[PDB]
Amino acid sequence: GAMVTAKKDENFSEWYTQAIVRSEMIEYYDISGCYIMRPWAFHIWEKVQRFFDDEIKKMGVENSYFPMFVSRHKLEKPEVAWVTHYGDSPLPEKIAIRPTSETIMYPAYAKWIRSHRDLPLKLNQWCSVVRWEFKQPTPFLRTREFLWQEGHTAHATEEEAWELVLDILELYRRWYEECLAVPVIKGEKSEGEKFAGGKKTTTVEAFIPENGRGIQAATSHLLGTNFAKMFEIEFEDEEGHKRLVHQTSWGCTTRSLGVMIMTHGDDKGLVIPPRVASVQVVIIPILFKDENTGEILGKCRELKTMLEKADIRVRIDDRSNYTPGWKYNHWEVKGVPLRLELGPKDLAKGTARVVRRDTGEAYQISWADLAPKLLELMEGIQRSLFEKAKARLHEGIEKISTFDEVMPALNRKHLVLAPWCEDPESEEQIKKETQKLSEIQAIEAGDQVMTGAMKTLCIPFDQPPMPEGTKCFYTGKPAKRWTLWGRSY
């Protein structure tokens, strides 16, 4: 059985590749930026999909399916894939593969919305989209084709639309923190980073300590009336006056899995939080030749049935052609959070040996105690994974006053929280300056595939105090808010 041999804290990229290949999460493909999602990864996607779909159904959002193609003139009302032929017959007008579906959906919204009684209109779809960039792709985190949901709502007032933006952003916080045990920071995107055409974009941002990079985990946009004006989406009040609708859109992708993998993995391979692990407990029988193997396997089956009564997801690995040691490594690499070992000694004592994946700590638990204690143990693992990741997030953010402090902090692979005047031009200049200083540094390093530019990640909702005369860290103008910056995906 393959072991992960790269160390997470020494060659992070090689570590990540080994962890996702050797655990059978991914397979490569002959078109660049496209990868195969194998069942071990797909199962985790199914779990978060089900969580989020159930939660938005409770909000009255209904699923739908809109075409994957969009006409040139509807899309252009650059990073798009264009279809131009069927067989060898040219199309009269090329058609694009969707990168996002506002321009596919909103002509229909304009047809469907007639009066205030048609609102709010709330739709979602689960599908894949294509964003054909040429920069370095990374499995799960940044790919040419990815799976996502996208929700699109329309409301009679801005207040109700904004309320929904924030309710969805809270569901994305729960997707990452409660399901995947990944801490995130809620905030607003800067004017240069917000969705094209929208009014205000909110985000949850995550952090990869090993390469210092922030990453946008999910996004929820107040489109306001901008798209309603573009698509003539209006409704009548009760006396017949026409008004524009107020819109949101929001989306979360398979990037989430990658974030999870990078957050919790260790030098042995994956560590999957128990709430989304497709196998929570793997039972490994010890099978000597000189034992009553039928009695040991019979007890493993009884324990499996007992655990499944508490809804624990259990597999018995009773393969005779591998040793227990081999199986220990096999399921460690795959990130199963609990292993249960049962041999003749255990049978005789009425106990089982349980080993937790995150710490390696082992417990002896009586069969009667097994189901409640495992449940307690899985909640403790989930909580411990989250708290440890949150401590690394906090340790990864430096509060600074002045631009002179930026390069030392980025050299420590940290994010910076700085007072900023929020001038869009300033962000563009900071990106270019940090980028050129990073190139110099790389040459002093004797070194390289992603950009060294520092950009804004999010103006966090939770704002530290801003003292009276605080200046912006780059311009010296009056600072308006604390903003989180870093290198990023």
Ligand SMILES: Cc1cc(N2CC[C@@](C#N)(C3CC3)C2=O)cc(NC(=O)Cc2ccccc2)n1
């Ligand atoms: C897997 C994944 C995710 C996401 N993005 C975007 C923001 C967002 C968020 N939040 C979406 C709105 C929901 C997200 O997850 C984007 C992508 N590829 C790309 O940009 C294309 C690409 C390919 C190679 C290199 C550089 C760029 N690939």
Ligand code: PRO
């Ligand atoms: O691509 C985006 O960011 C928005 C949210 C999902 C639909 N379009």
Ligand SMILES: [Cl-]
């Ligand atoms: Cl479905």
